[PDB]
Design a protein around this ligand. Structure first.
Ligand SMILES: Nc1ncnc2c1ncn2[C@@H]1O[C@H](COS(=O)(=O)NC(=O)c2csc(-c3nc4ccc(O)cc4s3)n2)[C@@H](O)[C@H]1O
Length: 522
């Protein structure tokens, strides 16, 4: 088949060594370049240079190494976005310790599940998540040491990263003579991300491939001095984990925000002369008729990238017009494929599309019932294969086999198609789709008519399901008759409106057709 969309050759080549070796290199170079900033906290106007950041990470790597951390070990990083977030991350990659990010805002049972799977020996937590760790550490004797990420001194009894380094580093330790560990790239896990979620094991190799897309001037961002990115996405999530690590490879300035504010964001875009802004589709609400935008100097802004959830083509084009960009750059990925494997290639837009198959990958679309590869414009389940695909779910080989087949194809459970130009469009998640009779109804299409809103299906005994909605006012039958008179016959709101304070969305933009399913049933 040429019914398989393949990715082109990389405009930037894969590189040798492990991911920590590749990163130690990049960052040591920048450390030696005075004044280059790794991270900026827009909330407290604080910078931390590549010189400082490299020194503390190397310092903390060696300190973990002397503590007895190695390839048999996992550590968890449990934190809101911060200047301190990537210190333990980087530190461990340099010496081959597995890093398991734990969701900042997980409840206790979710946080217990996560760590139960990841089995951490040392836990890194912000001050904000400490009591959550303590409350569940009871059930997890694997944890022997707890360290506070964002404190200089000890904190309520626990060593901080700084005081920990002090006890385990020899004085007059030179950070520029530290050499990271070499080991098997495909065999040594770098990260364990969560999806009840499962631990996604990602070998060093998958981050090394990512480091090719990151520097690829067509699929990523060409290394160019004094480049500043403004990232809003969470670091414990694949979206933020692998975009950010790619930025440090490029030596970019990552201006982070621990919570989106309308004014702060627009402030920092101008102030920090920012070239690229990393958002999630939910934050496009605020830039509908955002009056503010017109005040600022957003002349430096070259692009705005979205991911992690669908962006309506309408609001995508609107927002882009407001920033005078050609359009919204876009990337599609799953936790299980490391980072984005569909990316809007520079110099090749297509509204609605999530992009084209990145280098090293192949994407295809299959029949739900027979698995046959489907052709152009034919909708079926999206399948991808390439070297960023996880090695497995940690300690759950069954679920690894249910997802990745013999030939290496990952089954995304997203319905999607490609066109004559090999651009890929994502309809919806398969389980998010409504089956009114035999006829299929896609939430995304109904919601753009309404626009807040969320569309799911009432399990009608008659039709199977009936296209329903939740509505956040800016009445009902004055809308169902508006719905029915916008769509066609099977897409009429055969399940009505149920007004709500707020539409159930996950931290990266996705809705919740399971919670919304339950919610409408009242
Ligand atoms: N761009 C998109 N458009 C529409 N839907 C999207 C989507 N991305 C994820 N999704 C949906 O969320 C699911 C994925 O959720 S997930 O498991 O938590 N993982 C992710 O969402 C995930 C893991 S890595 C990553 C991204 N990396 C990027 C790098 C550069 C860039 O410009 C944009 C992006 S997005 N996203 C998908 O299965 C799909 O349903």
């Amino acid at each position: 088949a040429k019914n398989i969309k393949k990715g082109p050759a990389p405009f930037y080549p894969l590189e040798d060594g492990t991911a920590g070796e590749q990163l130690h290199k990049a960052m040591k170079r920048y450390a030696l370049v005075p004044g280059t900033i790794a991270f900026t906290d827009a909330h407290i106007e604080v910078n931390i240079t590549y010189a400082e950041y490299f020194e503390m990470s190397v310092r903390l790597a060696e300190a973990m190494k002397r503590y007895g951390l190695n390839t048999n070990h996992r550590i968890v990083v449990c934190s809101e976005n911060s200047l301190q977030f990537f210190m333990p991350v980087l530190g461990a990659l340099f010496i081959g310790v597995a890093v398991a990010p734990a969701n900042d805002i997980y409840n206790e049972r979710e946080l217990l599940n996560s760590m139960n799977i990841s089995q951490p020996t040392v836990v890194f937590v912000s001050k904000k998540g400490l009591q959550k760790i303590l409350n569940v550490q009871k059930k997890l004797p694997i944890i022997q040491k707890i360290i506070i990420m964002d404190s200089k001194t000890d904190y309520q009894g626990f060593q901080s990263m700084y005081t920990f380094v002090t006890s385990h580093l020899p004085p007059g330790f030179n950070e520029y003579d530290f050499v990271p560990e070499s080991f098997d790239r495909d065999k040594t896990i770098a990260l364990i991300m969560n999806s009840l979620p499962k631990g996604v094991a990602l070998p060093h190799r998958t981050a090394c491939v990512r480091f090719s897309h990151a520097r690829d001037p067509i699929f990523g961002n060409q290394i160019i001095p004094d480049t500043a990115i403004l990232s809003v996405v969470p670091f414990h999530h694949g979206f933020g984990m692998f975009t950010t690590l790619g930025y440090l490879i490029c030596g970019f300035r990552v201006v982070l925000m621990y919570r989106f504010e309308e004014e702060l964001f627009l402030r920092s875009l101008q102030d920090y002369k920012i070239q690229s802004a990393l958002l999630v589709p939910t934050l496009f609400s605020f830039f509908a008729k955002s009056t503010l935008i017109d005040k600022y100097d957003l002349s430096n802004l070259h692009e705005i990238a979205s991911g992690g959830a669908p962006l309506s083509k309408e609001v995508g084009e609107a927002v882009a017009k407001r920033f005078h960009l050609p359009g919204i750059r876009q990337g599609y990925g799953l936790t299980e494929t490391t980072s984005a494997i569909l990316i809007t290639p520079e110099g090749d837009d297509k509204p609605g599309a999530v992009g084209k198959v990145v280098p090293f990958f192949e994407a295809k679309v299959v029949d739900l019932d027979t698995g046959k590869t489907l052709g152009v414009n034919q909708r079926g389940e999206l399948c991808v294969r390439g070297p960023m695909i996880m090695s497995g779910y940690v300690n759950n080989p069954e679920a690894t086999n249910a997802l990745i087949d013999k030939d290496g194809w990952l089954h995304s459970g997203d319905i999607a198609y490609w066109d004559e130009d090999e651009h890929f469009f994502i309809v919806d998640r398969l389980k998010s789709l409504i089956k009114y009779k035999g006829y299929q109804v896609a939430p995304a299409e109904l919601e753009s008519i309404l626009l807040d809103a969320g569309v799911a299906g009432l399990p009608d005994d008659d039709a199977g399901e009936l296209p329903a909605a939740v509505v956040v006012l800016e009445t009902e039958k004055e809308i169902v008759d508006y719905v029915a008179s916008q769509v066609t016959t099977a897409k009429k709101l055969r399940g009505g409106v149920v007004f709500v304070d707020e539409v159930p969305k996950g931290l990266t933009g996705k809705l919740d057709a399971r919670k919304i399913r339950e919610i409408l049933i009242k």
